[PDB]
Amino acid sequence: KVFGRCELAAAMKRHGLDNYRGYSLGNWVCAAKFESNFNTQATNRNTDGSTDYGILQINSRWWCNDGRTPGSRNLCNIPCSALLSSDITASVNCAKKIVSDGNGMNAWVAWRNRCKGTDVQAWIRGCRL
Ligand code: NA
Numbered sequence: 001k002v003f004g005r006c007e008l009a010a011a012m013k014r015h016g017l018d019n020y021r022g023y024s025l026g027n028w029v030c031a032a033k034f035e036s037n038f039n040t041q042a043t044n045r046n047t048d049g050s051t052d053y054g055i056l057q058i059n060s061r062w063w064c065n066d067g068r069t070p071g072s073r074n075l076c077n078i079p080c081s082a083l084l085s086s087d088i089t090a091s092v093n094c095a096k097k098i099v100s101d102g103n104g105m106n107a108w109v110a111w112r113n114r115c116k117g118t119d120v121q122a123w124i125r126g127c128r129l
Contacts, residue, residue: 001086003038003055005029006127008088013129015092021099025129026120027111032056033123034110040091041084054083054091056108063094 003011009029012018018025035057036042044052050061050069060069064080076094083091098107105111 001040003032003040005033005038005123006129008032008038008055009124009127009129011088012092015089017092017095018129020096021104023099023105024120026123027105027115029123030115030118030120031105031108031111034114035108040086040088043084051080053080054085055088056083056091056095057110058083058091058094058098063098 009025012028013025017023017028032038032055036055038055040055042054042057044057046052046059048061050059050072051066052059053064053066058064058076058080060066060080061072063074063076064078064083065074066080076097078090078094083094099105101107105116
């Protein structure tokens with residue numbers, strides 16, 4: 001599913017991301033836009049053989065099981081296909097965990113390079129929240 005901006009904001013808010021680990025909602029919306037273009041089905045293969053899945057491009061080295069990422073972990077205890085669902089529930093749960101791992105949202109390269117230090121509130125402007 002391809003979310004609309006405000007539709008995703010609302011969904012993220014209901015699943016408890018505004019202001020989670022001190023990250024206001026706009027940070028999360030911004031990260032989704034640039035990681036996936038707001039597509040739940042987005043997959044991207046990396047140079048190490050890992051793959052990034054879903055709206056927040058969660059990576060198979062560490063957080064989910066794809067069966068083709070040898071010596072990898074599965075911290076989130078899920079099949080990476082769970083992260084492509086139209087229900088962003090499992091993505092959000094796993095991302096909590098990620099944003100707890102010590103580097104905060106710097107775990108998302110797109111966030112660091114395109115959202116950090118910007119007016120992230122612009123991503124939720126206009127929305128009924
Ligand atoms: Na894995």
